[PDB]
From a paper:
Despite the rapid development of antiviral vaccines and some approved treatments such as remdesivir and paxlovid, effective antiviral pharmacological treatments for COVID‐19 patients remain limited. This study explores Nsp15, a 3′‐uridylate‐specific RNA endonuclease, which has a critical role in immune system evasion and hence in escaping the innate immune sensors. Structurally, SARS‐CoV‐2 Nsp15 forms a double‐ring‐shaped hexamer that consists of a dimer of trimers. All Nsp15 subunits in the hexamer can be occupied simultaneously by substrate molecules, whereas disruption of the hexamer significantly reduces the enzymatic activity (Deng & Baker, 2018; Kim et al., 2020). The catalytic triad, found in a positively charged groove, is formed by a lysine (Lys290) and two histidine (His235 and His250) residues (Kim et al., 2020).
YM‐155 is located next to the active site, forming an interface area of 190 Å2 with Nsp15 via van der Waals and π–π stacking interactions. This interface involves four out of the seven key Nsp15 residues (Kim et al., 2021), i.e., His235, Trp333, Thr341, and Tyr343, and the non‐conserved Glu340. The compound mainly interacts with Trp333 via the imidazole and 1–4 benzoquinone rings and with the catalytic residue His235 via the pyrazine ring. These interactions result in the blockage of the catalytic residue His235 and substantially narrow the uridine binding pocket, making it effectively inaccessible. For the YM‐155 structure, there is a small movement of the Trp333 in comparison with APO Nsp15 structures. In nucleotide‐bound structures, Trp333 can form stacking interactions with both purines and pyrimidines; there is a preference though for purines, as shown also in this work, with the purine‐like moiety of YM‐155 (Wilson Byl et al., 1999; Zhou et al., 2009). For a large number of inhibitors though, ~40%, we observed that upon soaking at higher ligand concentrations, there was a distinguishable difference in the c‐axis of the unit cell compared to those reported in PDB structures. In these crystals, the c‐axis ranged between 104 and 109 Å upon ligand soaking, compared to the usual length of 110–112 Å. This effect was also present, but not so dramatic, in the YM‐155‐Nsp15 crystal structure, in which the ligand was found only in one of the catalytic domains of the asymmetric unit since the second catalytic domain, especially its active site, could not be fully resolved. For YM‐155, we also observed redox sensitivity in the biochemical assay, suggesting a putative unspecific inhibition of Nsp15.
Residue numbers in the entry:
A (entry chain A), B (entry chain A), C (entry chain A): 1 to 346
The structure:
Amino acid sequence: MSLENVAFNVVNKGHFDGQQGEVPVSIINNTVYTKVDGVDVELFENKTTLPVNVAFELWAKRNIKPVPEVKILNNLGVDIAANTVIWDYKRDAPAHISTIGVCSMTDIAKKPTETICAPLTVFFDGRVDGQVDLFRNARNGVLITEGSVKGLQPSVGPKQASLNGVTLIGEAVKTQFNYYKKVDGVVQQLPETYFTQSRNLQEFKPRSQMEIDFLELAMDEFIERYKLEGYAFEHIVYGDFSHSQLGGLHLLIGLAKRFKESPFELEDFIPMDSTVKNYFITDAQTGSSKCVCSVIDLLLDDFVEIIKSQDLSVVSKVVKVTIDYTEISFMLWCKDGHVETFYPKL
Amino acid sequence: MSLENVAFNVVNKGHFDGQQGEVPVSIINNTVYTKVDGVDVELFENKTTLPVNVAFELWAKRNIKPVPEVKILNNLGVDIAANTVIWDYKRDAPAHISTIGVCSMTDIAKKPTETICAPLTVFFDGRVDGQVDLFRNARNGVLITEGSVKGLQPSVGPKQASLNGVTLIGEAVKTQFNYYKKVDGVVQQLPETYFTQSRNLQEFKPRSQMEIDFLELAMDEFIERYKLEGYAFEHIVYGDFSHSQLGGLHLLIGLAKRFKESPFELEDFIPMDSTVKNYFITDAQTGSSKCVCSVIDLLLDDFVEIIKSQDLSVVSKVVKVTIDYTEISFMLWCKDGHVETFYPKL
Amino acid sequence: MSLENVAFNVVNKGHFDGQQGEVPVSIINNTVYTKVDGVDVELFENKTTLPVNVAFELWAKRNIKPVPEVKILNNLGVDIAANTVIWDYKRDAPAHISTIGVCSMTDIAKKPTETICAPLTVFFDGRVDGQVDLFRNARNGVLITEGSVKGLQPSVGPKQASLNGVTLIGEAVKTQFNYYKKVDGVVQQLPETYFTQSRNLQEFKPRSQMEIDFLELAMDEFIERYKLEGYAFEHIVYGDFSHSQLGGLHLLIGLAKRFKESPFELEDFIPMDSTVKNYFITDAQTGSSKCVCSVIDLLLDDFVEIIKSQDLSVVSKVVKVTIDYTEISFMLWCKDGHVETFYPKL
Ligand SMILES: COCCn1c2c([n+](Cc3cnccn3)c1C)C(=O)c1ccccc1C2=O
Ligand SMILES: COCCn1c2c([n+](Cc3cnccn3)c1C)C(=O)c1ccccc1C2=O
Ligand SMILES: COCCn1c2c([n+](Cc3cnccn3)c1C)C(=O)c1ccccc1C2=O
């Protein structure tokens, strides 16, 4: 361990790479600086709740390969990672507060076989040599692999993974993982799940013919083509901006469509990675706004499947949907056999 | 009062909504965090000169309806608001340092009828029940309403208002208010005033045929059409970029026209809401710059009216114009019956 | 000296201009505020390693004329400036930690003729009266002028200079300087040098017919036209995104071409001004990434000249090129008389 050594690696290798060497370091203002040719240059600003120098080290020792999005790990109940740091780029902080064989200040253990780790769900990366076997010996754990594991039934994970804070479907690298989980020394069967698409509002990319049609076509043209009469897409997806309180607008693709033609404000008042997000929206054009707007990025085809697979005979009820391996509650309101609204409740 | 309760509301409702409940809270680094599933998530970064936890509470209890822009309130001499917080999004801080019936740390009173409030100009919102009557009983105050008040002559305010930091002309909600003011227990007659348009440089929207022509047409074509020869629009509005010191460029629409074709730097060295703004501009293309460039966003039609309504017989003089209810001083330079320049002086 | 006076100047003149007057000032949170109509407004946030009030003063007293880019001054070995502050906008801090006749807290001297300055390479600005003569009397120094100096052989500097953080080729102002340097009281002959173009990725402007062709034409079309077969532009300039480790992509123009069609992430892990830059790149489309990607912004014509002026008979060797007056090392890899790669090594 050495602050100056960590700094040397960041300067010379872009991250911690176990290289020998030292550079001069100063710490002020929750910030780490290094001296370059007689002047101080900022290397790291600490936005975590850890000590500046500890956060610096964990950031430097972050996983720089494609890794599961934090929301996936959280949903599977991961407490800690084996011999790596999953950096949470949404929070600009470590996904997990403790480590195993990374950093002396945050380590609870050097190896995941230590008894302190037993009650924790440890994340194992099958791409790293030996970690598949560690998962077999672990009481509680989650495992990812690129291929088959002998004697374990896989769960096909999302297409996308996070690489240095960039969520992408890898072409030059593999981002689709098989998932395995153990609880109390017993291999679990992971449930059937939809997956969120983890897209952003600005450069929203469609991933189906339906989504291409939605973005290109007008509202009534689209609803007609896919026979979505009575499912209240006008409200739920397209959004209603007629009243002071903004109605619906619960699918990300719907936001992307409007943002294209008419910008608006999104306040991310809980800035973290989560399967579904709450935003305080204010529509700049109309002045329609709402304090808590639940937004989820499902493939529109998946959302259509879900809403078409519900009974529409009651006024209001909770609808449970497994998304990203967690149970998301939706509220379904109907009237005379038609949907009034269908939105996630967090 | 309760920090944890305020936090609960922000997490669950997006703002303070008087709901019961508590969440775990940590305060570090002038920042408020809450614990979500074993990890700390940032709720609020304090950029005010108040204590972090006080600023947090005032922000949470901000007015989330369309409200007057801070510049309007400042110009009318408002010192404090009755039973609400006008959040200043330009400064990312409370518009007023004291409160009435909001927060125990900043309250000077629970109700505006208390004698401490007498010398202060209190802001009353007629949309809130009872506040019209409080204004009648108040010695010093400013009132807004959507409609008529019995026995009071109104002043028609700006078309636009601020909703959650977004200045807009409301369609789904009403943003145009009637204004009333009292001084020493006497109802004032508010002066005839122009209003600034409160637009931004990037997505500048024209609001007249003249403004559409200005943006579309070339300089000489426009000046010809509206017979603006001798009023020196070339300098004042379009701007002169021939010399090291940038000449003119005092209307926002003029900046918007050039930014469209040729980007430049604007240093907002006094970041606050004000009827007219001073910027340190540097033109990227030419290298023409000026330390103090006074810029005001008047409707071009209004600006044309003002400059055409002046005597042009003297070399230099001060011209007073009521804008946003305050007296803005302009310097008018003329030569042989022609304008040389006409710009606001702050 | 006076904090309140410095603040008065910033408020009234946009920078320090030696005007008399005072405004109320508060210092909290490494931030300087001033009181305007009963509310605090932020004037300056300190991002330097100096005391907040010292950094404020140096920033206020920054040079607001076109000045050499910091990388140029660093390369020429400048330690200090005579009677001015070169503000480093890349680091948001003073380029030099000490001053001469600027600020009482940072001054080592009032005038550069003081004996403390003898071992330091002082930067002299010939546009300022008397400083040419000070350079003649100085033991160690660097001088810039707009025109000829009697009895000194000039070095023609870059076309571009920095004006208030904006690098530009001046039209309304002169940005091309003659350079002179003295070491141990002896005038030096500055070496023949290429210059970097100091452009940015987003609004990349071509400055030759070759560069226009590169941006417009496809890869194979361009390589054919300029007979660049065997120089491995496919790898070096255009970049290879086929493997998990990103190959090549060492010219800024190459990044600009791809960013146009396909965005990517650049982590500037040493945020300073330097002749060549190291970035941690992650390609959003492919997932191809690399921790240390050396990038230099040479005019493509200059880069073509350099690579065509090398012997290609050995497997690997270091190639030294004078750029921005400093020796930049390139690694040249060849195979059977063809280039494999040619990239800067820092
Ligand atoms: C309008 O209230 C009458 C009964 N009702 C409610 C809802 N809806 C459906 C709907 C469809 N489109 C637009 C608006 N509402 C109806 C018909 C809600 O979705 C709702 C959500 C959260 C709290 C309460 C309610 C609620 O009471
Ligand atoms: C050039 O000085 C000769 C007299 N004069 C001055 C002005 N103008 C008008 C003008 C019109 N277009 C471009 C430039 N100036 C003239 C003709 C100013 O506007 C001015 C502003 C602030 C301080 C002083 C002056 C000032 O003295
Ligand atoms: C692939 O290794 C076999 C020998 N070699 C190496 C290089 N190249 C050229 C090349 C051209 N295009 C793409 C990739 N490489 C070859 C042929 C490097 O550039 C290099 C850079 C830094 C450290 C080591 C090496 C290195 O060893």
